[PDB]
Amino acid sequence: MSALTQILIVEDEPLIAMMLEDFLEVLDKTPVGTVDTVAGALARVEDGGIDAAILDVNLRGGEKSTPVAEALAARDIPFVFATGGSDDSVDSRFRDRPVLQKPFTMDGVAKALAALLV
């Protein structure tokens, strides 16, 4: 198998969550789990065995959520952010890193997954 197939997703919108699960399966990867709270994201990242993960700027209740992506930097795990028509308030501390936003094509997610190496 490839060096990158186990991927976690973190979203609070139904569409962006199911679209990311579909794109991993067609890339022969594996959506190993999905969560909508940061305590669930900290519980999933601690399980280990994950190759990369995706994270929205805010979860349910609109509360800020970066305790995991700071942990992905400590675990040297690659990461992508997620934004929207009003969730694009991503911190400049991660604007040097890839971010998915509005609905995307097969090439749009491949662009972010390539930035995990670039």
Side-chain angles (χ1 to χ4, degrees):
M1 293 74 182
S2 298
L4 169 55
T5 82
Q6 308 301 288
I7 295 186
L8 201 92
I9 301 163
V10 190
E11 256 290 348
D12 65 359
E13 183 170 354
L15 275 168
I16 312 303
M18 65 175 67
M19 286 296 293
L20 285 172
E21 291 172 358
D22 180 24
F23 283 125
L24 290 175
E25 172 66 5
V26 73
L27 292 173
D28 291 356
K29 304 190 185 302
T30 308
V32 314
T34 318
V35 315
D36 52 0
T37 81
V38 84
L42 282 171
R44 278 296 193 134
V45 74
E46 175 62 3
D47 191 17
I50 301 169
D51 302 339
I54 313 182
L55 181 68
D56 45 348
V57 181
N58 56 75
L59 273 52
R60 290 171 65 151
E63 181 176 356
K64 174 173 177 293
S65 293
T66 82
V68 319
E70 293 287 356
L72 300 192
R75 298 160 182 267
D76 186 29
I77 305 181
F79 56 81
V80 181
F81 281 92
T83 51
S86 63
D87 291 338
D88 52 7
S89 297
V90 60
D91 189 8
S92 65
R93 178 166 167 87
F94 307 111
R95 288 183 184 243
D96 295 353
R97 291 287 76 216
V99 53
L100 297 176
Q101 194 164 109
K102 47 67 170 298
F104 32 72
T105 84
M106 180 78 274
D107 293 356
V109 308
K111 186 182 186 62
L113 290 171
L116 299 183
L117 291 307
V118 177

Coordinates of all heavy atoms in Angstrom, one line a residue, residues 18-71:
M18 N -19.2 14.2 3.8 CA -19.4 13.0 2.9 C -18.7 13.2 1.6 O -18.3 12.1 1.0 CB -20.9 12.9 2.6 CG -21.5 14.2 1.8 SD -23.2 14.0 1.3 CE -24.0 14.1 3.0
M19 N -18.3 14.4 1.1 CA -17.5 14.6 -0.1 C -16.1 14.2 0.1 O -15.5 13.6 -0.8 CB -17.6 16.0 -0.5 CG -19.0 16.4 -1.1 SD -19.4 15.5 -2.6 CE -18.2 16.2 -3.7
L20 N -15.6 14.4 1.4 CA -14.2 14.0 1.7 C -14.1 12.5 1.8 O -13.1 11.9 1.5 CB -13.8 14.7 2.9 CG -13.5 16.2 2.7 CD1 -13.2 16.9 4.0 CD2 -12.2 16.3 1.8
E21 N -15.1 11.8 2.3 CA -15.2 10.4 2.5 C -15.2 9.7 1.1 O -14.7 8.6 0.9 CB -16.4 10.0 3.3 CG -16.2 10.4 4.8 CD -17.4 10.2 5.6 OE1 -18.4 9.7 5.0 OE2 -17.4 10.5 6.8
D22 N -15.8 10.4 0.1 CA -16.0 9.8 -1.2 C -14.6 9.9 -2.0 O -14.3 9.0 -2.7 CB -17.1 10.6 -2.0 CG -17.3 10.1 -3.4 OD1 -16.9 8.9 -3.7 OD2 -17.8 10.9 -4.2
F23 N -13.9 11.0 -1.8 CA -12.7 11.3 -2.5 C -11.5 10.4 -2.0 O -10.6 10.1 -2.8 CB -12.3 12.8 -2.5 CG -13.1 13.6 -3.5 CD1 -13.8 14.7 -3.1 CD2 -13.1 13.2 -4.9 CE1 -14.5 15.5 -4.0 CE2 -13.8 14.0 -5.8 CZ -14.5 15.2 -5.3
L24 N -11.6 10.0 -0.8 CA -10.5 9.1 -0.3 C -10.7 7.7 -0.8 O -9.7 7.0 -1.2 CB -10.6 9.0 1.3 CG -10.2 10.4 1.9 CD1 -10.4 10.3 3.4 CD2 -8.7 10.6 1.6
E25 N -12.0 7.2 -1.0 CA -12.2 5.9 -1.4 C -11.9 5.7 -2.9 O -11.4 4.6 -3.3 CB -13.7 5.6 -1.2 CG -14.2 4.3 -1.9 CD -13.5 3.1 -1.2 OE1 -12.8 3.2 -0.2 OE2 -13.8 1.9 -1.7
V26 N -12.0 6.7 -3.7 CA -11.7 6.7 -5.1 C -10.2 6.8 -5.4 O -9.7 6.3 -6.4 CB -12.5 7.7 -5.9 CG1 -12.0 9.1 -5.6 CG2 -12.5 7.5 -7.4
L27 N -9.5 7.4 -4.5 CA -8.0 7.5 -4.5 C -7.4 6.3 -3.9 O -6.2 6.3 -3.6 CB -7.6 8.8 -3.8 CG -8.0 10.1 -4.5 CD1 -7.6 11.3 -3.7 CD2 -7.2 10.2 -5.8
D28 N -8.2 5.2 -3.7 CA -7.8 4.0 -3.1 C -7.3 4.2 -1.6 O -6.5 3.4 -1.1 CB -6.8 3.2 -4.0 CG -7.5 2.6 -5.2 OD1 -8.7 2.8 -5.3 OD2 -6.8 2.0 -6.0
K29 N -7.7 5.2 -1.0 CA -7.3 5.5 0.4 C -8.5 5.1 1.3 O -9.4 4.5 0.9 CB -7.0 7.0 0.6 CG -5.9 7.5 -0.4 CD -5.5 8.9 0.0 CE -4.5 9.4 -1.1 NZ -3.3 8.5 -1.2
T30 N -8.3 5.4 2.6 CA -9.3 4.9 3.6 C -9.7 6.0 4.6 O -8.8 6.6 5.3 CB -8.7 3.7 4.4 OG1 -8.2 2.7 3.5 CG2 -9.7 3.1 5.4
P31 N -11.0 6.4 4.6 CA -11.5 7.3 5.7 C -11.6 6.5 7.0 O -12.6 5.9 7.2 CB -12.9 7.7 5.1 CG -13.3 6.6 4.2 CD -12.0 6.0 3.7
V32 N -10.6 6.6 7.8 CA -10.5 5.8 9.0 C -11.4 6.3 10.1 O -11.6 5.6 11.2 CB -9.1 5.6 9.5 CG1 -8.2 5.3 8.3 CG2 -8.6 6.9 10.1
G33 N -12.0 7.5 9.9 CA -13.0 8.0 10.9 C -13.3 9.5 10.6 O -12.6 10.2 9.9
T34 N -14.5 9.9 11.2 CA -14.9 11.3 11.1 C -15.5 11.8 12.4 O -16.3 11.0 13.0 CB -15.9 11.5 9.9 OG1 -15.4 10.8 8.8 CG2 -16.1 12.9 9.6
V35 N -15.2 13.0 12.8 CA -15.7 13.5 14.1 C -16.2 15.0 13.9 O -15.8 15.7 12.9 CB -14.7 13.4 15.2 CG1 -14.1 12.0 15.2 CG2 -13.5 14.4 15.0
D36 N -17.0 15.5 14.8 CA -17.5 16.8 14.8 C -17.3 17.6 16.1 O -17.8 18.7 16.2 CB -19.0 16.8 14.4 CG -19.9 15.9 15.3 OD1 -19.3 15.2 16.2 OD2 -21.1 15.8 15.1
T37 N -16.5 17.0 17.0 CA -16.1 17.7 18.2 C -14.6 17.5 18.4 O -14.0 16.5 18.0 CB -16.9 17.3 19.4 OG1 -16.4 16.1 19.9 CG2 -18.4 17.2 19.1
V38 N -13.9 18.5 19.0 CA -12.5 18.5 19.2 C -12.0 17.5 20.2 O -10.8 17.0 20.1 CB -11.9 19.9 19.4 CG1 -12.0 20.4 20.8 CG2 -10.5 19.9 18.9
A39 N -12.8 17.2 21.2 CA -12.5 16.1 22.2 C -12.5 14.8 21.5 O -11.8 13.8 21.9 CB -13.5 16.2 23.3
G40 N -13.3 14.6 20.4 CA -13.4 13.4 19.6 C -12.2 13.4 18.7 O -11.7 12.3 18.3
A41 N -11.7 14.5 18.2 CA -10.6 14.6 17.3 C -9.3 14.4 18.1 O -8.4 13.7 17.5 CB -10.6 16.0 16.7
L42 N -9.2 14.8 19.3 CA -8.0 14.5 20.2 C -8.0 13.0 20.5 O -7.0 12.4 20.7 CB -8.1 15.4 21.4 CG -7.7 16.8 21.2 CD1 -8.0 17.7 22.4 CD2 -6.2 16.9 20.8
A43 N -9.2 12.4 20.6 CA -9.3 11.0 21.0 C -9.0 10.1 19.7 O -8.5 9.0 19.9 CB -10.7 10.7 21.4
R44 N -9.2 10.6 18.5 CA -8.9 9.9 17.3 C -7.4 10.0 16.9 O -6.8 9.0 16.5 CB -9.8 10.4 16.2 CG -11.2 9.8 16.2 CD -11.1 8.3 16.0 NE -12.4 7.7 15.7 CZ -12.7 6.9 14.7 NH1 -11.7 6.4 13.9 NH2 -13.9 6.4 14.5
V45 N -6.8 11.2 17.1 CA -5.4 11.4 16.7 C -4.5 10.6 17.7 O -3.4 10.2 17.4 CB -5.1 12.9 16.7 CG1 -5.0 13.5 18.1 CG2 -3.7 13.1 16.0
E46 N -5.0 10.4 19.0 CA -4.2 9.7 20.0 C -4.2 8.2 19.7 O -3.3 7.5 20.3 CB -4.8 10.1 21.3 CG -4.2 9.3 22.5 CD -2.7 9.6 22.7 OE1 -2.2 10.5 21.9 OE2 -2.0 9.0 23.5
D47 N -5.1 7.7 18.9 CA -5.2 6.3 18.6 C -4.0 5.9 17.7 O -3.6 4.8 17.6 CB -6.5 6.0 17.9 CG -6.8 4.6 17.8 OD1 -6.2 3.8 18.5 OD2 -7.7 4.2 16.9
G48 N -3.5 6.9 17.0 CA -2.3 6.7 16.1 C -2.6 5.9 14.9 O -3.8 5.6 14.7
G49 N -1.6 5.5 14.1 CA -1.8 4.7 12.9 C -2.4 5.6 11.8 O -2.5 5.0 10.7
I50 N -2.6 6.8 12.0 CA -3.2 7.7 11.0 C -2.0 8.4 10.2 O -1.0 8.7 10.8 CB -4.0 8.8 11.6 CG1 -5.2 8.1 12.4 CG2 -4.6 9.8 10.5 CD1 -6.0 9.2 13.2
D51 N -2.2 8.5 8.9 CA -1.1 9.0 8.0 C -1.3 10.5 7.8 O -0.3 11.2 7.5 CB -1.2 8.3 6.6 CG -1.0 6.8 6.8 OD1 -0.5 6.3 7.8 OD2 -1.5 6.1 5.8
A52 N -2.5 11.0 7.8 CA -2.8 12.5 7.7 C -4.2 12.7 8.2 O -5.0 11.8 8.4 CB -2.7 12.8 6.2
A53 N -4.6 14.0 8.3 CA -5.9 14.4 8.7 C -6.4 15.7 8.1 O -5.6 16.5 7.6 CB -5.9 14.5 10.3
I54 N -7.7 16.0 8.2 CA -8.3 17.2 7.7 C -9.1 17.9 8.9 O -9.7 17.2 9.7 CB -9.2 16.9 6.5 CG1 -8.4 16.0 5.5 CG2 -9.6 18.3 5.8 CD1 -9.3 15.8 4.3
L55 N -9.1 19.2 8.9 CA -9.6 20.0 10.1 C -10.2 21.3 9.7 O -9.6 22.1 9.1 CB -8.5 20.2 11.1 CG -8.9 20.9 12.3 CD1 -9.8 20.1 13.2 CD2 -7.7 21.3 13.1
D56 N -11.5 21.5 10.0 CA -12.2 22.8 9.9 C -11.8 23.8 10.9 O -11.4 23.5 12.0 CB -13.7 22.7 9.7 CG -14.3 21.7 10.7 OD1 -13.6 21.0 11.4 OD2 -15.6 21.7 10.8
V57 N -11.9 25.1 10.6 CA -11.5 26.2 11.5 C -12.3 26.2 12.7 O -11.9 26.7 13.8 CB -11.5 27.5 10.7 CG1 -11.1 28.7 11.6 CG2 -10.6 27.5 9.5
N58 N -13.6 25.8 12.7 CA -14.5 25.7 13.8 C -15.4 24.5 13.7 O -15.8 24.2 12.6 CB -15.2 27.0 14.0 CG -16.0 27.4 12.7 OD1 -17.1 26.8 12.4 ND2 -15.6 28.4 12.0
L59 N -15.7 23.9 14.9 CA -16.6 22.8 14.9 C -18.0 23.2 15.5 O -18.3 24.4 15.5 CB -15.9 21.7 15.9 CG -15.0 20.8 15.1 CD1 -14.0 21.6 14.2 CD2 -14.2 20.0 16.1
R60 N -18.8 22.2 15.9 CA -20.1 22.5 16.4 C -20.1 23.6 17.5 O -19.2 23.6 18.3 CB -20.7 21.2 16.9 CG -21.1 20.3 15.8 CD -21.5 18.9 16.3 NE -22.7 19.0 17.0 CZ -23.6 17.9 17.1 NH1 -23.3 16.8 16.5 NH2 -24.7 18.1 17.8
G61 N -21.1 24.5 17.4 CA -21.1 25.6 18.3 C -20.2 26.8 17.8 O -20.2 27.8 18.4
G62 N -19.5 26.6 16.7 CA -18.7 27.6 16.1 C -17.4 27.9 16.9 O -16.7 28.8 16.7
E63 N -17.1 27.0 17.9 CA -16.0 27.2 18.8 C -14.7 26.9 18.0 O -14.7 26.0 17.2 CB -16.1 26.3 20.0 CG -14.9 26.5 21.0 CD -15.1 25.7 22.3 OE1 -16.1 25.0 22.4 OE2 -14.1 25.7 23.1
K64 N -13.6 27.7 18.3 CA -12.3 27.5 17.7 C -11.8 26.1 18.0 O -11.9 25.6 19.1 CB -11.4 28.6 18.1 CG -10.0 28.4 17.6 CD -9.1 29.6 18.0 CE -7.7 29.4 17.5 NZ -7.0 28.3 18.3
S65 N -11.1 25.5 17.0 CA -10.6 24.1 17.2 C -9.2 24.0 16.4 O -9.2 23.8 15.2 CB -11.6 23.1 16.7 OG -12.7 23.1 17.5
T66 N -8.1 24.2 17.2 CA -6.8 23.9 16.7 C -5.9 23.1 17.6 O -4.7 23.0 17.4 CB -6.1 25.2 16.3 OG1 -5.5 25.9 17.4 CG2 -7.0 26.2 15.5
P67 N -6.4 22.5 18.7 CA -5.6 21.7 19.6 C -5.0 20.5 19.0 O -4.0 19.9 19.4 CB -6.5 21.4 20.8 CG -7.9 21.3 20.2 CD -7.8 22.4 19.1
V68 N -5.7 20.0 17.9 CA -5.2 18.8 17.2 C -4.2 19.1 16.1 O -3.2 18.4 16.0 CB -6.4 18.1 16.6 CG1 -7.6 18.1 17.6 CG2 -6.9 18.7 15.3
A69 N -4.4 20.2 15.3 CA -3.4 20.5 14.2 C -2.1 20.9 14.8 O -1.1 20.8 14.2 CB -4.0 21.6 13.4
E70 N -2.1 21.5 16.0 CA -0.9 21.8 16.7 C -0.2 20.5 17.2 O 1.0 20.4 17.3 CB -1.2 22.7 18.0 CG -1.7 24.0 17.5 CD -0.6 24.9 17.0 OE1 0.6 24.5 17.0 OE2 -0.9 26.0 16.5
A71 N -1.0 19.5 17.5 CA -0.5 18.1 17.8 C 0.0 17.4 16.5 O 0.9 16.6 16.6 CB -1.6 17.3 18.5

